[PDB]
Amino acid sequence: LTDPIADMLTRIRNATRVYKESTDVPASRFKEEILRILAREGFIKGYERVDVDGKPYLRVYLKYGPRRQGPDPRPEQVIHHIRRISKPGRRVYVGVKEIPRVRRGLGIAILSTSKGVLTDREARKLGVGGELICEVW
Amino acid sequence: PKKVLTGVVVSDKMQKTVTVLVERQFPHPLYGKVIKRSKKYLAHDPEEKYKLGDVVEIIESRPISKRKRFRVLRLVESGRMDLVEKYLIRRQNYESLSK
Amino acid sequence: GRYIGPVCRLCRREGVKLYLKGERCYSPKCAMERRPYPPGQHGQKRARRPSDYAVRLREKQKLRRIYGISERQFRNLFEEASKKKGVTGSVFLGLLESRLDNVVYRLGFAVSRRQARQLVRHGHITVNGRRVDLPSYRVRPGDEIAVAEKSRNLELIRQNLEAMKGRKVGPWLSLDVEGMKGKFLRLPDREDLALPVNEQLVIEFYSR
Amino acid sequence: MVKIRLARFGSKHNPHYRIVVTDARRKRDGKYIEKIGYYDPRKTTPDWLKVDVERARYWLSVGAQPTDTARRLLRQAGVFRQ
Amino acid sequence: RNLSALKRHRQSLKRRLRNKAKKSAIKTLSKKAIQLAQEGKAEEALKIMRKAESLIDKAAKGSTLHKNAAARRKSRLMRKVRQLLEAAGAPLIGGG
């Protein structure tokens, strides 16, 4: 496994697309800090540290919209979109002045900075930059 | 200031001179990724005290010879032959890239 | 220079009276009153559906034909508007308006912009005192647009000054007849002019 | 020596010099060492002359030599008032 | 077809004479003195060495030697003479 982070985000996207209530990803005090952004910003209900076969995991509680009318009754997603930016193949770093506005504000860019994991909004607030972990909307 | 660089000694087969290999990273100007590039400096060692495997710092200095414009500033670590291997194995591999 | 030919065919092609003459524009001897179909052998033939391209060309040509201005000059203004702050469609109409010869025709000193040119060109006009005979002078707020003293006493300008006495003049202008002088109050809000131009279609012409 | 003089900018029949400190061996309109004011011989605006006077005294203090018709525009701005 | 650049060449030729002339002597003497100091012959070496040192600094007054050349020439003279005398010694006059 070469990208624990992408692996997580993908475990989610994959789950969210068949409408699972939850899905578990292998635990990391960094992966957590990202989920701590994902829930706070209201993309997930939240997470809890559980265990599977003795091994530390993060069970992640997924969130969607109403049932819908039409021949396809499947609800809208709350996480419509989530994708790595920086990767191990190509680390992506931004100064504060060049942090992107995801989707006109309606989405976020989580970022690892030396003031911890922030959103665009949060980063610009404390006025620091860093590795741009990913984007969600 | 006088530019200072840190690197491994890869040759001591000269008298009063060592070859110090300095490495650096930098984002690719277009493709973003952090990439390494390295370069050998001939460093003045009047004392023949620096040896193969030494990780050292060298300081840009007034020219000593053609090609020698750095003196060894000071030792940093001893015995990194594992680096010297990296370099040497690459040179040795060159015998296979010919015709 | 400017167009200088049969001017009625213009209106006829545009399908709209543009008031390019002055007096005759208002009579029933107006071309568009007699033959409101396009000039030449084919105007009576049934029009076929104009292309999108067609449409925007026409709108631009019309706005341009009104001011009798050369296409280069038109263009240079429009660009000027695209660098200038705000809404380009506005500013463009505004900047088209702040031209001397238009202001002069706006303030009524002549019956046609065509006539209002030859007036500026023949040095019969002034701004803030000084004589100006450049039809393209970009007039700013505050500017006093007079008749030449030596030109005040002239038949044509008399007859044309007399026709202005109680005619009201755009919210962005003031006219002091007898005193033969007028004032550029501000740049025109779009509403302040009501030209048969969807100037939006113009921006769209130049974005191809 | 280092000199203080007029570099002609502007355009044809429309002079606009920059009183300027440059090396004597430069070309007229060349790289100057420092700009220190301007001069409009046609006098066509409220301030057709200006001089950083605190500066022009430094360059002088340290050996710059003004041209003739620069000396004047430095007198007229009273860099010489004792 | 004419100039005062001609004049300027005329003079160069003449300065050249005085220069070459001056530099010859300086070398002649330093060598003479280094030669003595090898087989030293202490007093005599030092005698000539002064005569060089004079001649060096004298050329340095003008365009012949740049003063640092003179410095450089002088330094290398003294270094040579002395260290030669150390295989035998001892310094008979001045100096120093």
Add this chain to the structure above:
Amino acid sequence: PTINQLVRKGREKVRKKSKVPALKGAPFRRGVCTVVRTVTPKKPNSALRKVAKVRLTSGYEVTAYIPGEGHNLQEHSVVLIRGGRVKDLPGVRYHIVRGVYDAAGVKDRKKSRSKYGTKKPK
């Protein structure tokens, strides 16, 4: 390709192949005609196209089109040429400029006259 692959090999800016080499970077080039004659065009056309083989100041010898109805070109006719092939006569890649050197304009053109070096009439 991976990002790495691109660090290693880069992307390749691809050059253009000029379609009028004989010009040698010139907008036009002078020449003399060797052969002046007619050529049959390819499917589905049919004609007797007028053509000159021209020897150039640029060392090259090419076939150039002679546009217009009728001309005055023969061997030794000095001619200016311009770029532009004639699609239906393969190998013809250049045009003779009428109205220049020994190539007359078209007698009696009224329309499109500049492209044919025919003067404004009475």
Add this chain to the structure above:
RNA sequence: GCUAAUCCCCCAUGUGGACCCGCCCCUUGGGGUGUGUCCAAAGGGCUUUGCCCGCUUCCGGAUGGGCCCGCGUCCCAUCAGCUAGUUGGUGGGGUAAUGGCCCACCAAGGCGACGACGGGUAGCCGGUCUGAGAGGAUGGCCGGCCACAGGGGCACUGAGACACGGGCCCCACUCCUACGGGAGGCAGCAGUUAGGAAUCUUCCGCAAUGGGCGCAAGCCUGACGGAGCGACGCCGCUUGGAGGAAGAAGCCCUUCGGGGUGUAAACUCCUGAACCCGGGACGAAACCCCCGACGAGGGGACUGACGGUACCGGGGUAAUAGCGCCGGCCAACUCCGUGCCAGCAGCCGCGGUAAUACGGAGGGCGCGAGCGUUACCCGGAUUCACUGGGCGUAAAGGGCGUGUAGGCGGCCUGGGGCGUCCCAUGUGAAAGACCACGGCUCAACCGUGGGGGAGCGUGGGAUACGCUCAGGCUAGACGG
């Protein structure tokens, strides 16, 4: 053969400065000090026991430079190996100065897939052009650096040159001549010729800015300031304006009733480019002279190539329009002629007797002292794709393993802080560009002010992710 000097030399004089040795600070050859040694000079002019311009040695400044280092700088790997002054060392030579820059000896090294060596192409930058941007393309004019001065080599003079209009030599070419001999170097401004698709007057002036010499008067200045030619470009302006028929003639169409050109013309009136007449600049106030003190300061005078031009006044004539296109893309349609011919053509395609596609015509569309064509650059081209593409069948998975370099890499904890991120500060010239204002009647053009940036140096700071060191783990992997 003669004679002068700010020419040359000798001695004197030593604040100082140079050099060897010692010693103190400093730490590459920086500053100080003691002994020894060595080094200065030119006087000219006034109003003449006093000032001006010089001359000398030292120190600092300022400005201009030399050298050195990090990083950046195109195409071909069908160029993969290159290197004997080669890489290092010791001593010397040389220079302002380090250095294999040069030399002697010694050692056997230096470089290379992070692309050496080789070939090809190109002066580099500020910028310019395009592009939403990223990027691409480009380096003409202006500014900066470099390099060169018929092709080569060389040094001399000098603060500075290995010197475009200085010197030496060799070559190639041309010329002159009295036939013995000798001379040249426009890639300075003009100009000739050749080449070419193609690129200017053998103009005027030092009035202005600048430079050189001079105490100054001033002299020189093809730098420069201007004038000439050329729609080459951009910007500005003209060939008029108002009125004027249910609407002439001519010409085109026509179902022969009419439709078009067209308010277009005529004609009527108004203005008044050009032209004529008068006046007529800004650019020029310093230098100098006067008083004062040859300073500060006040006042006097000279001087304008452009140019009697711009411009101001008065008078005053209706006064150049051309080019492309009209099958679709693409805005603009009918008649005749032609009949797979003549021809058009950027792509698709038009023409074989009713062609909106050829040629002419009427009419129409687009621009207008321009319009078109050819060439080339970016664009459209997300068609080299970083932004921002792809590989079952469209072009595209290596025949398969094994493995070197490389690229990449699980969970937890600490140290370091390289990447990364923040702040401060220096640098980021000027012009250009962007925003504001202002001057030429506008504009173009031009001036003043403002706004920043990447990037790189320096100081400080942060530690999440990447890194690195250190210590744990067992989910990857390996083993029993």
Add this chain to the structure above:
RNA sequence: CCGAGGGUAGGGCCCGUGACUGGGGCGAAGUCGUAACAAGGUAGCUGUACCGGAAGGUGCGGCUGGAU
């Protein structure tokens, strides 16, 4: 001594050109046949090999991208 260059001798790369020659592209108004496309009238294609005026054929092995 070094030294522009000159001379001698032998190498390397590149460009132009050459009797003749090999195929290639095109043209098309021709001769010969009909190899592929249908089970294309012998399923096709294929690497190799031998062979034949020519498309091609046959052997060996492979693929189905083969009709029934």
